[PDB]
Structure formats: C-alpha cells, structure tokens
Amino acid sequence: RTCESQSHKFKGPCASDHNCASVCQTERFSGGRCRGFRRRCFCTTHC
C-alpha cells in the first residue's frame, strides 16, 4: 500500500523536497516531499 507519513526529523520547514527526501532516504526507506512546497515534509513508503 502507498503509505504516507510525517518527517519531524528534518530541521524546520521544507528547505527543499530533494533535501528532506535525501535525509528521509539516508535514515530510512521512504521517499520524502513537502505538502505543496515549503510547508511540511511527508515521507512515502510501503506500510
């Protein structure tokens, strides 16, 4: 299932999708992006 989650690990707001993604991918396996842009970073994975 396409599963989405939140990234409270990333520092502050969404500096850049690719950045929060890289972080979220370096710690775990979950592709990360931001709600719209700049707002808040969510990570997607298979739950």
Q: Enumerate the β-bridge partners of residue 1.
A: none
CA distances from 7 to 2, 17, 21 (A): 16, 12, 10
Fold of 1-47: Defensin A-like (3.30.30)
Question: Obtained via which technique?
Answer: NMR
Cβ-proximal residues to 34 (8 Å cutoff; 6+ apart), any chain: 14, 17, 20, 40, 41, 42
SS3 14: coil
